[PDB]
Amino acid sequence: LDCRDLQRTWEVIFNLFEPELQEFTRKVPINHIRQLVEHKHAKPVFSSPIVEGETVMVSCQFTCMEKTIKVYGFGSNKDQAKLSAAKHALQQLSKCDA
Amino acid sequence: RYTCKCIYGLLLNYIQSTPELRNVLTPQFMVGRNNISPDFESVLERKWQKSAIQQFRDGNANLMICSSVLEEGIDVQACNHVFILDPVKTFNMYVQSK
Amino acid sequence: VSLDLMNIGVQPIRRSKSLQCLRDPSKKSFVKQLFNDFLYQMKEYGIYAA
Amino acid sequence: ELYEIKGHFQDDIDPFTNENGAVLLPNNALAILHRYCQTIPTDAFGFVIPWFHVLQEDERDRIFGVSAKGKHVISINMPVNCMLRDTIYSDPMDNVKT
Amino acid sequence: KPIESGGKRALFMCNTVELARQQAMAVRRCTNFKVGFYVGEQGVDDWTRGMWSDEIKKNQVLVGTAQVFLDMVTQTYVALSSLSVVIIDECHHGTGHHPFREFMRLFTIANQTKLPRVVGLTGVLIKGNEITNVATKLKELEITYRG
Amino acid sequence: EAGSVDHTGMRLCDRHNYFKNFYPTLKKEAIEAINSDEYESSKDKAMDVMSSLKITPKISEVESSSLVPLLSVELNCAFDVVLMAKETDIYDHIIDYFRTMLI
Amino acid sequence: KYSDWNEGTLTEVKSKLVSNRNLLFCLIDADIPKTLNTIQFTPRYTWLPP
Amino acid sequence: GISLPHNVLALWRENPEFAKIIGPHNLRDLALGDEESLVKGNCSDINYNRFVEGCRANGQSFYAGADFSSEVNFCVGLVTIPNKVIADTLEALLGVIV
RNA sequence: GAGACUUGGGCAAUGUGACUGCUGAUCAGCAGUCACAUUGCCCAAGU
RNA sequence: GACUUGGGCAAUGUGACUGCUGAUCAGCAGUCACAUUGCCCAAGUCUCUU
């Protein structure tokens, strides 16, 4: 609204976005549990969630390229715990895939 | 309001201690809405659904603790006794309580 | 007297009915109300009631 | 009689009716305004209430002339999300509540 | 007869929820009418305009607490002419800006010829401790309620 | 949270009996210490009594508008307990608390 | 256009405007979708010569 | 031999409206080093700017609407005395002279 | 085509739980305003 | 000298009515979280298909 130049706004946006633009073009981010499912080699075996109080735990066992590592996701909602466990399994798999 | 719950608990304990009042008496209490929890155990859930007024009218509870709600025009079974534990404040309060 | 100095984060300003006298934030007022009611119960009905 | 009824009722702040028969009452104005303010916050954090303020004698003079001498006036500041940013003032009433 | 053909309904106001419920049960047992019930405990605000209309088309008598009916009439879901009677239990509370007196104030705004019959009910006529000079209190009450 | 974990195993109607139900080994020497008047200062008495029950201290500075710092103390035991006052009184407050509970 | 609207109504009416059904109903009376190439072209079984 | 830094004292005495919002907490932030305390006699420029900005936020954070004079009055030499004591000291002076 | 599995965009509700906000009345304290009663004093008149 | 009327100045009170503060109680509204089982679309991986 101030500059009223699309090129200037584009310059500002690119200056703000360059590291993420470079990183994401090299490796496109996708949904974490969808990524884990699309990594069929891991075969993520998520157990059914259980609830204690108002917090829900989801336990997962996935083949981390050498072992069936067991991880637990904790969150206020069943999907929240699902996502937490999925992301933690993904980071463990990434560390093993060094 | 809190006086209702407090005296309800005291009456429960006193009735249960005495051998005479043990069987004859059965207390029950009420305040307005924002209904305070009728339990002292801090349990997350209570399954009970029957109203206190129905228990009183049906003869389930024959000793009703009430606060400025059961005073106005509440039709009930033939009540042999009425106790005004706190001093009367207003003319209409006295009239309706009588 | 300890709680009046708690310095909770920013809270809605509370004032009297005609808006000249200030009041404590809702949480402090609620805690004080509970304790005052307990004191009233103890004073009026006895130790067992408390 | 009509005379006594009119004299007893129609002497305080006048009511308002629109072109569709809907009736707005002075005692319900505060409730209506607070209810409307509760609907506008887009998130659970941005809850905000109207800012009532009482003008001082110098302000009373500068805004209303001499006619406001000895009568209270209340300035109300609407939250930023709403249409209003004009700090509506009330007419000089005999008391701050009115 | 339906509301659009001039149908009329009957209100039965009350001050407390339990009293309103008991009176609703009493009317239900003593008459053949399908009486309504409207209190803020369960929530009535979602009973919106069109379904206010189908509710009043469904029920003949409305038994509930004062504030719900006051909000209904002020927002003009139903006109005063669409009522035949207005019964107010414990009418001795109708002073100052109490919803009973507010409702009776709302009465004077509408056409005077279309006002329903008002039947206040009470076992006591004095509100506060100003039991002296009862005559002024009675004149105030009989000016509030139009009888 | 480092706290807020209730594993005392006692009903809330009787959880206050936690300090009463310890072994006599800690209790007798702790009450002897808290009843001893020769102590150098209230802080020293508080620290010695708290160490007697093997309960570790945890003192942090709560933000406040008071010029004198408003300090809170956490005991870190299985029983979730927290006390707070002016630092000139927190030690005597601990004295009073453990004097009341330990019987 | 609606400069003074609340943002919630603005995004709701935006979603209605960018809704699939609105774009559809624009294109039906735009008379365009009659020419879309969508069938998997098979001349022997799903096409007629001129 | 001890005093407040000379720059902050000058700010305190020359800016009464900014003075009235200074709280003891803002003084607690001024953990001046050995050089500032002993040799220079006042806080550094960066510390001075940090103090003024912290107090500017102090005037608008939770601390707003409070009065800190009861704790920071001694720093500038102000003290609050009841009117009774001020009368009694004069009267006792008459007593001692008599 | 038959399907299983996941994230979504949602549409529904059966729960249930807690939060927040406001109106009204009553009492108590304080402040102020209306009228009225009692004991006086004095004056104005008329016969 | 009785009789009558009226007014004014006093004090001693009473009856209420508002205004402010605090407390108590009833009365409404806006929400939010979230287990449970359902329904319709969008894109995915795999058996089969091939």
From Swiss-Prot, chain E:
Function statement: Double-stranded RNA (dsRNA) endoribonuclease which cleaves endogenous (endo), exogenous (exo), and viral dsRNAs to produce short interfering RNAs (siRNAs). The generated siRNAs then mediate gene silencing, also called RNA interference (RNAi), by controlling the elimination of endogenous transcripts from mobile and repetitive DNA elements of the genome as well as exogenous RNA of viral origin. Also acts in an RNAi-independent manner to activate translation through cytoplasmic polyadenylation.
Tissue expression summary: In ovary (at protein level).
Domain comment, as recorded: When in complex with loqs isoform PD (loqs-PD), undergoes significant conformational changes during the full ATP-dependent dicing reaction cycle for processing a 50 bp dsRNA with a 3' two-nucleotide overhang and a 5' monophosphate terminus. At the initial dsRNA binding stage, the helicase and DUF283 domains transition from an extended to a closed conformation, this anchors the bound dsRNA through major and minor groove recognition and forms the ATP- and 5'-phosphate binding pockets required for dicing activity. The N-terminal helicase domain, containing the Helicase ATP-binding, Helicase C-terminal and Helicase insertion domains, functions in dsRNA stimulated ATPase activity and RNA translocation during the dicing reaction. Essential for processing endogenous and viral dsRNAs. Binds and hydrolyzes ATP enabling the dicer to translocate along the long dsRNA substrates, and produce siRNAs processively from the end. Some reports suggest the domain is essential for the recognition and initial binding of both blunt (BLT) and 3' overhanging (3'ovr) termini dsRNA substrates.
Species of provenance: Drosophila melanogaster
Motif residue range(s): DEAH box: 89-92
Family: Belongs to the helicase family. Dicer subfamily.
The protein's name: Endoribonuclease Dcr-2
Domain Helicase ATP-binding: 1-143
Phenotype seen when the gene is deleted: Abolishes RNA-induced silencing complex (RISC) assembly and RNAi silencing activity. Abolishes siRNA unwinding prior to loading onto the RNA-induced silencing complex (RISC). Decreased levels of endo-siRNAs. Increased susceptibility to infection with RNA viruses such as Flock House virus, Drosophila C virus or Sindbis virus. No effect on the processing of pre-miRNAs. RNAi-mediated knockdown inhibits the induction of the antifungal peptide Drs in response to M.luteus challenge. Also highly susceptible to infection with A.fumigatus, with 80% of flies dying six days after infection.
Subunit: Component of the siRNA-directed RISC loading complex (siRLC), composed of at least Dcr-2, r2d2 and Taf11, which processes dsRNAs into duplex siRNAs which they then load onto AGO2 to initiate formation of the RNA-induced silencing complex (siRISC). The Dcr-2-r2d2 complex exists as a heterodimer and heterotetramer, with the latter showing higher siRNA binding activity. Interacts (via N-terminus) with the siRISC loading cofactor r2d2; interaction is essential for formation of the siRLC and consequently, formation of the siRISC. Interacts with Taf11.
Subcellular location: Nucleus; Cytoplasm; Cytoplasm, Cytoplasmic ribonucleoprotein granule
